[PDB]
Each structure stands twice: as structure tokens, then as C-alpha cells.
């Protein structure tokens, strides 16, 4: 522990919307300092979303205006993608970094496969 809770795969309808669940149980002392969602490009995970102390940042142009990440509940950083294209099919990684009172950082990630249907 901690671990992220992310399904092995999700489906979304072509031209519709999809939610990629990424949840965790908040732990006493583990302050969330970074959230990233990444898309797998061969051997390279590529950041598409970053949440840091300055706010939310969409890091790949093709997701601009189509990407939201939950923020209202501690431990729910699920990703929502709208107007799905067939070219959105990929493996997506949820990655959360926590910092403990001593300054140590702990990182966890987990992969889901997004399939776009119909």
C-alpha cells in the first residue's frame, strides 16, 4: 500500500464519452502532490494531463477541450474523455505521487486499456 484502483480495460462509444476510473484510499500522512495521466506510445508513456500545485494542465494538444480529471473527492482522480475518436484507443496510465511529513515521496501507477466501440 498505497495502490491505485484502476480496471484492466474500459470501453467508450465512438463519438461519445468515457470514464477511466482511478481511485485510492487516502492514507494519514500521504499528501497528494502530483497526479498524471499518461498515454502509452510504444515503449514511452506520454503525459497527457498533469495536476500540480499550480493547477491542472493538458499536455497533449489532441486532448484539449475533451479531458477532465475528477478532483472533488480525495482519492478519486478518474479521467473523463469526451467525443471519442478511434485514435483514442490506447493504454492509459494513472499515476499519483504522495509526499510524507519527512519529505519522502511515494509513487504508484496503474494501466487501463481504453477501447472505442461501434
Amino acid at each position: 500500500r498505497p495502490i491505485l484502483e484502476v480496471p484492466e480495460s474500459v470501453t467508450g462509444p465512438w463519438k461519445g464519452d468515457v470514464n477511466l476510473p482511478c481511485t485510492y484510499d487516502p492514507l494519514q500522512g500521504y499528501t497528494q502532490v502530483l497526479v498524471k495521466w499518461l498515454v502509452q506510445r510504444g515503449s514511452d508513456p506520454v503525459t497527457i494531463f498533469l495536476r500540480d500545485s499550480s493547477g491542472d494542465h493538458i499536455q497533449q494538444a489532441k486532448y484539449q477541450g475533451r479531458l477532465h480529471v475528477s478532483h472533488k473527492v480525495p482519492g478519486d482522480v478518474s479521467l473523463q474523455l469526451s467525443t471519442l475518436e478511434m485514435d483514442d484507443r490506447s493504454h492509459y496510465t494513472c499515476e499519483v505521487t504522495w509526499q510524507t511529513p519527512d519529505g519522502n515521496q511515494v509513487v504508484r501507477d496503474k494501466i487501463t486499456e481504453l477501447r472505442v466501440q461501434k
Partner: nanobody, 124 residues
Framework: VQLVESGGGLVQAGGSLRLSCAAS????????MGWFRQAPGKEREFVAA????????YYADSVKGRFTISRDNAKNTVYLQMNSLKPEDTAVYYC??????????????????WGQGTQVTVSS
């Protein structure tokens, strides 16, 4: 997903063994695979891991330069070549599978599937 280990047994210090682990399913390449070990009276500890996709490899510091992990995705098989074996390497070795990518591969809670283990004994 079922995981089945092969290999193991008795070897002399300085010798070597190859362990293997076969996985069911059809999405093997997207799983990170790991090896863990447990000696009697001690807790289970990380040995090596290999990431999904590009297959980055990670090793406990005490096995770096001695053990090598690799995978054959067309065979759903992960291998552990344990060279330069020492009596301190005596333990039951377990293969495991999870959906981590670059982080958390040392944390046993990050692996959802486990084999029953194979015993390795290194005699001096």
C-alpha cells in the same frame, strides 16, 4: 489469471538456476511481472520485476549483477536467470503479475496474481 513456476532445486554456491513462470490470458504484454522470495522465518521480499510494454527491468540491490529477468510475450512466460548464487539466496521464489507501469513494482499489494512458489536451496 493463473501463474505456474518451473525450475528450482539444490545448487552449490557460485552455481546457477533458471526459473520460469507461465501466465494464462491474452493480454500478457500489458502486465508487469515480478519475482519475490521468502525464507523461513522472514517476510517475503522483492527480487526483480519487468515492466509491461518496453520491458524495463528492476532488481533488488543485493541481486544486481547476479540475477537477470526477461520475458517472452508470445509465450506468456517470464524468466529469472539466477547466477552467482549464495547461501543467502535460499528461499521460496514466487512469480507475480500486476498492472503497474513504471512505479510500485516492489510493493506486493500492486500484484493481483501469484504463483505458489518454487524452492531454491544454495549449499556451500
Amino acid at each position: 489469471v493463473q501463474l505456474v513456476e518451473s525450475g528450482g532445486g539444490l545448487v552449490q554456491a557460485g552455481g546457477s538456476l533458471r526459473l520460469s513462470c507461465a501466465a494464462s490470458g491474452r493480454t500478457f504484454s500489458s502486465y508487469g511481472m515480478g519475482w519475490f522470495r521468502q525464507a523461513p522465518g522472514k517476510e517475503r521480499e522483492f527480487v526483480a520485476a519487468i515492466s509491461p510494454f518496453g520491458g524495463n527491468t528492476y532488481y533488488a540491490d543485493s541481486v544486481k549483477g547476479r540475477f537477470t529477468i526477461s520475458r517472452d510475450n508470445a509465450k506468456n512466460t517470464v524468466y529469472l536467470q539466477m547466477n552467482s548464487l549464495k547461501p543467502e539466496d535460499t528461499a521460496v521464489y514466487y512469480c507475480a503479475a500486476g498492472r503497474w507501469n513504471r512505479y510500485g513494482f516492489e510493493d506486493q499489494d500492486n500484484f493481483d496474481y501469484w504463483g505458489q512458489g518454487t524452492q531454491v536451496t544454495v549449499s556451500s
